[PDB]
Each structure stands twice: as structure tokens, then as C-alpha cells.
Amino acid sequence: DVKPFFDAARELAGGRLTQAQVDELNKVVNRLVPDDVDISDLGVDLIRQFEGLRTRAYQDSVGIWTIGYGTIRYPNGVAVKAGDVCTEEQAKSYMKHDLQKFVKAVNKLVTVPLKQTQFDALVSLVYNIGEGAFAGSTLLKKLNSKDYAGAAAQFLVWNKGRVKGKLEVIPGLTNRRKKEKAYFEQH
Amino acid sequence: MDVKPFFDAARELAGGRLTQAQVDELNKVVNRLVPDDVDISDLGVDLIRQFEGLRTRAYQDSVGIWTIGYGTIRYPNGVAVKAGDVCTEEQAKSYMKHDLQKFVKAVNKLVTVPLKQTQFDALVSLVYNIGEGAFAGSTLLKKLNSKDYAGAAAQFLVWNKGRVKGKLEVIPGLTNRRKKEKAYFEQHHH
Amino acid sequence: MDVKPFFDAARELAGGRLTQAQVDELNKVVNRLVPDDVDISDLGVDLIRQFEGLRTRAYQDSVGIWTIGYGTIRYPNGVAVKAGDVCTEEQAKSYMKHDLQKFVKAVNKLVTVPLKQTQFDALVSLVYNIGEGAFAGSTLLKKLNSKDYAGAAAQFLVWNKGRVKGKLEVIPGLTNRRKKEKAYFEQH
Amino acid sequence: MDVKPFFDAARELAGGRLTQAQVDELNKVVNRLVPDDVDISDLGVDLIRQFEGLRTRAYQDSVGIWTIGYGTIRYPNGVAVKAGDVCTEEQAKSYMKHDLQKFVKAVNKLVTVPLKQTQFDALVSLVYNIGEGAFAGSTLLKKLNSKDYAGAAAQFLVWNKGRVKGKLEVIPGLTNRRKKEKAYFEQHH
After folding, report:
1. Cα–Cα distance for residue pair C4/B27, rounded to 1 Å
2. Is A7 in Cβ contact with C116 (below 8 Å)?
3. What CATH number does residue C175 fall under?
4. Which residues of C are catalytic?
């Protein structure tokens, strides 16, 4: 029931809403679901499958204590330390919390509307390439246009990573972008 | 105004609370809902009218153009003042308010910082007296859009010259006009 | 208007996030930084004066009360009008502007939706003529406070009646007045 | 706290300046925006530590709950203490400091007058022992928020009772603890 919201908005606007203002309100109503637009548990499943589950805390390559699916700090802010243990279900919940920076980034940077499956796939990509890369990205140019084609094709462009100091195609990244692109394309 | 009912309604849609991003989104739409352009007030028309002679019968000004009221040449419906026309004071106020819309539009476009109504009215009075090009090139507008409101106020007083024969000079009464407009502009209350 | 720099600065002061109570506090203070000011316009006063006679010396109205100007029975200083009083038209207009302040307040209070200045003007005229009590209970006001501005405009014309020997009937002139007020309410 | 961007943003909204009344209402919002934020000091933790023995091996308390350190039953990461757990004195201090964070928050939220660090530390020691609810409804807090510091100090001494055979009775151990907390609260120089 958006009638109270629309009436409260009429007050702010002077009594009536223009057609453009109705369109801007309608965009806001989509963001007013409880806790805002978030990655779904299926989107978390999409992401976890590309990583290893560790039930015991361990030190990553740069020395940082890590648990679960790459978690270094628990939802309450406390750092993972030696001797920590987690279940699969805890590891999923920790990863969901670690994705919140990237959920927020997709919501902010994407100005056109999105289906939940498009959103989940975009969170997977941005988790893996970073906020800055996504923000500066030709993909975000084409997507902010309701072009769910040049954006979905731009997934496959992000299959490079560093080997011996240069970028080269990483087979695992090629597979992951194909799965993400297929997710973003679901009906 | 307080947007409380807007946020209350949004809060209930969002399950009892708003996240920081939801608050930011609501603030963007508030910006786009709240009307942003403004008109000169009747107290602003009085500020300008004060210094003008009122004519209730149409007359020819120095270049032959039929005029009525407080310098009106064309009515709101676009019809030129003609010989034999008559007006009341109330009509003359209404005609000059329409005459002023040129300068209301210019102050709205050219000023990029928020204005109180009293500030807006005093600027329209100045622009009416000096015109859009002088205003737009002014140090007044530069200091104002830089949020130096008090610096902008002081610049009212430099616009006290008018043409006499082939030159400009400080006019008897123009300093006093600018002073009154500066005082209006710097009102702290009501 | 633009509240984003205010909320950005408030968020950073609060430690990087705002609670629900803090958001509501910020909204409350913005309304004190930019408060709404609503008064009858000069044309709205004219709209009402249209219908009244100017009296430059006090007379008794139909119920015996001494009146002067455009219907003034108490001066801005609180003194009641009395026999022998005289006034200029400028004084009369000043008294009448003060007379309408009570109704500027009442329209602002009973109406909970925004109003264009022309809408506000026409409503003060109506409420001055019919009184707050009739206004409060009116179908007009319920539609208006529902943001049904078109519906409220058409309700003007039902207020063309008054009391003769103890019940309602149409008063000559009130139909024309309500028609003029409706037009006024509906300008663009 | 740097309130200048907030005032400057408020000035902008208001047409370039603030009236005296607007400054006064903006200052009230600032009070609501800035957290009281005091933390217990290391010396305050020592005050609370001293009432308990350090236990380096997990043990079951008097109601069966596995416990370690200075009365810790749940680690900072949220994991319950379990049988076989061991800790160092430094870890046990850490767990205590996390255990106190709920009560640090409560003292900050409930006290609305300025507090010396030593005053704050002693209040956290009391509230940890008596709980947030008892402190919230106390005469101590009402005298304290009235700027009656000396009266609040005296109110420490009335919190020396605990349950004995189902009713409240004075417990000398609590009397001695309240005396030390009051002495700590009244420090200066």
C-alpha cells in the first residue's frame, strides 16, 4: 500500500505530483523494501561456489587469519583468530555480511532498475573486480540505459587476471563470468 | 514543511526502520519534490513601488510610449497601454508585479545559493533598477554564489550611479535607495 | 532545496551512521531552518474588500454593534469601536488587514495540505464569510484535506445560504460571491 | 567532534546565517548526534578485575555455565566458553573489556551530565554488578543527572544488598566493593 507514501509526497511537492515526480517516487518505492535491496541467498550460493569452504581458521597468503569463505572479520566486527571454527551455515552468513559493501555499491552506482537475478549477478562480479573497476566500467555505462544486453555482454570482458606481471585470460574467470552472465540473463 | 509524514510512511513500507541508503534516497526525492523557484512577495513589490510615481491615467513618456500605473507599458494579457486607459492602484501593483517577472526569472536562474524571501525581494529590487546584465556581471553575484552573503550585501551600495546627459554620476536618492534595499536584504527575522 | 550536505555532515558527526531518532531530529530542525510563512496576499484582501462598503464614521450594524471601516468592531490596539469614531480609508484598510489575521491563522490550521497563494486567498474569503465552525464541518474541508483540490473547489458553491427567520435559504449575492471565489481558487 | 561542516550546511539552508534561536536548536541536535562515547579505562578494568580470581582453565560456574578468565562466558566473537578452553591473563583482560561494552554503552546513554574518566569507570563497575535496569531506575542516576555528584557518590553505598535465602540482605563483600567504587568515583588531583 503506497497511498500514504504518495500522499505524503504530494504534501512535499505542493499538493499534486508531476509525471516526472511520479517516476522518481516509483524508483524510490523499489528501494523501500525492508532492509533495502540485498543479495539473495541464491546469489550468495552463486558466489560461494567459486571459493573454498574452510571450517577452521587459517592464515591466507598475506598472513591474515581467515575462516569460512574468505571471512577475516565476523559480523560483530571482531577479527578471526587462530582456533576459530565455523559451520557451512555460519560461513554463508559471514559471507553475506562481507558482501554488504558491494550490495551498497551496486544499489548506489546502478541508477536503472534491476531484477533480483540481475542484482545478484552484479554483486558477484563487483565482489570479484572491486567497486572502482565496476564504477569506471564500460559495463556500468551500458547498463545505466536499460540496455540489459551490452551490460550482460560486458560480463565476459572481465576474465583477465595477473600472471607473471601482465594480464592474461584466466580459465576459471572465463567460467565464472559465463555462469554470472547466465545468471544475470535468467527469466 | 517538516518531511516527517514522508519519512513515517517510508519507514512503514520499509518494515519499521530506514537504512542509511534509504534515508539518502528519500533525501534525493525530497530535493526533487520541494518547489525551488519563487516569486517576489507583495512586501517586495511595496519595497520597489515606494520610490515610483503612480499614474492612474495613461500618458506618453519621453520617447512617445504610452505608459500607465508604475511605468507599465504592456498589460499582463500582452496588450499595449493606449491613450485613454485608466487604472486603479491595485491594478497598477498587479501590472508592475507582472512587469517584474523578467527580473524574478533572472534572480532565480542566476543565484545558485539558497535565499530567504526577504533576500530574494531585495535582489529583484536591485535587478529591476540595474538590469540583468549588470547584475549577472556583478561582484555582488560572485560574492553571493560564493556564500559571502554579507559581502553581497555591501555590493548593493556600489550601484548608486545613473546617467545624466553623457555620463554617469552618483544620484540624489540612489544611495538612499540602495541603503534601504541593503537593509531589507539583511533582515534577520520576520 | 538540498538537504544532502546537511545530512552528510550530520552522519559524519554521528560516527558514520544515523539512527531513526537522529534522522527525525534532523528533519525537525530543517523545518526550523526553512519554515513556511503564509499570509493573505494583497489581491486576496482586495477579493474580500470587493464585497464590503467603506464607512468612514462609526455606525451601528443590524444587531446594534458600532462598526467602522470595512466591518471593523475592534481596533488593532484592542479598543472597541464606538459612536463618533472616524477613520480614513488607509486606516480602514489597516484595520481590516488586522481583522483577517485570525482567519489567516485558522485556514492555516484547519487545512493540513499545501495551498497555492490563490487557493489560500480564496479560502480566507470563504471562512471570513461563513465562519470557522461551518468551515470545520464542511464537505469542502474534508475533500481539501484529502488532497482533492478539484472536489474542494466545487464545494464553494454550496455556501450561498444564510439564516432567515430560523432556517437556511439562498441569500441574493452569495451565489455570485461563491462563484467569484471558486474562480479565484482555481487560477493557475 | 568537528561541528563546523554541520553548522556551515545549516547556514546554507537558512540563507547564509543562523539566528540565536536557530543556533540553540542546532546545538540540541548536536547533543543528540554526538555519542557520549567514553570507554572504560585500563585502570577501570583493573578496578573491576580485582573482585574476581583469574581462571586460566574453563570451569563450570554455580549454575553449570562454562566460564573462564574473569567471569567470561562468551568470547568477543560470540562463541560460548566450552570445556577444555584455556586463556592467558592478557586474553582474559580482553574478554572482560568486551564483556563490559554493553554496560559502557548503558552508562553513556543513561548519564546526561559530564563525567570525569574516574567517575565513569566507577559507574561501569557498579552497573556491571547491578545491571542496566537497576541503574536506570536508581536514585543514584537521578541525583547524578541533577549535577548532584556528591549525592550520587553517597548512593553507591546503598547497593550492598544481595539475595540470601530468597530475600535481600546486606552482604559484606558488596559493602566493601561499593566502598571501593565510591572511593574511585570521588578521586581527583
Report:
1. 7
2. no
3. 1.10.530.40
4. 52, 61
